[PDB]
Amino acid sequence: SVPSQKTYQGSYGFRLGFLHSGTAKSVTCTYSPALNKLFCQLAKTCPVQLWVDSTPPPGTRVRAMAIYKQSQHMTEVVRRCPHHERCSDSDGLAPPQHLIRVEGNLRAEYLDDRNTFRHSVVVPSEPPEVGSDCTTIHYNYMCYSSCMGGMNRRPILTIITLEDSSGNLLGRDSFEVRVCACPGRDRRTEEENLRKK
């Protein structure tokens, strides 16, 4: 009923990385290591780095899925709100109900799980470009955390899984997400609250 969120590096040493984008009022995506939390504007590019210590086999894939963070909501499928699922903003590949999209990857596949009804987006895993030490996937979040009838102010986590060609688990990592109008201010506010507590 609930996908695992346990961090698991696995045989290949899989883990995520994030850029250091700062907290200026104009920032569109920013990651807080102290909160393990990404703050981003609606439908803006969120770069997520994929790091491994050793090379996984051909056919390895990378899946992203959102779940509610609070235990009393974990069994509810995270989906776009009644407004955004109808707003005709599809990219030609993502179903309009899906919160998480991958940008700029024609091999992205979108799954509606036939048993759990949860949504996810999966891409073939690829090595870095020549000159780079990690692979970057660009995600978009297609509703605000506040959207009524959707996330409705409830915090979510994104779970990133490294999978073999059958979908078996090779590695797992995760981070909280807030989709909001002013990620820089909200990151500063939440980090201050953490320090005060």
Ligand X SMILES: CNCc1ccc2c(c1)c1ccc(Br)cc1n2CC(F)(F)F
Binding site residues, ligand X, CB under 6 A: 14, 50-52, 55-56, 58, 60, 62, 125-128, 133-135, 162
* Nearer CB in complex with ligand X: 132/189: 132
β-strand partners of 101: 140
Location of structure tokens 């899989």: 14
Q: Which does 84 bind (CB under 5 to 8 A by kind): Zn ion, ligand X, none?
A: Zn ion
Distance CA 44, CA 35 (A): 21
Q: Which does 32 bind (CB under 5 to 8 A by kind): Zn ion, ligand X, none?
A: none
User: Which residues in the chain belong to E strands, given as ranges?
Assistant: 15-17, 29-32, 37-40, 46-51, 61-68, 100-102, 109-112, 119-124, 135-141, 156-163, 169-179
Location of structure tokens 């470009």: 129
* Nearer CB in complex with ligand X: 147/170: 170
Q: Which does 125 bind (CB under 5 to 8 A by kind): Zn ion, ligand X, none?
A: ligand X
What is the helix (H) or strand (E) element at residue 196, kind and residue range? helix 183-196
* Nearer CB in complex with ligand X: 126/192: 126
- CB–CB of 32/176 below 8 Å? no
Q: Which does 60 bind (CB under 5 to 8 A by kind): ligand X, Zn ion, none?
A: ligand X
Question: Residue 81 annotated as binding?
Answer: yes
Question: Residue 84 annotated as binding?
Answer: yes
Closest CA to 156 of 139, 177, 174, 186: 177
Shortest distance, position 51 Cβ to ligand X, whole Å: 6
* Nearer CB in complex with ligand X: 82/167: 167
Shortest distance, position 54 Cβ to ligand X, whole Å: 7
Annotated binding site: 81, 84, 143, 147
Annotated binding site for Zn(2+): 81, 84, 143, 147
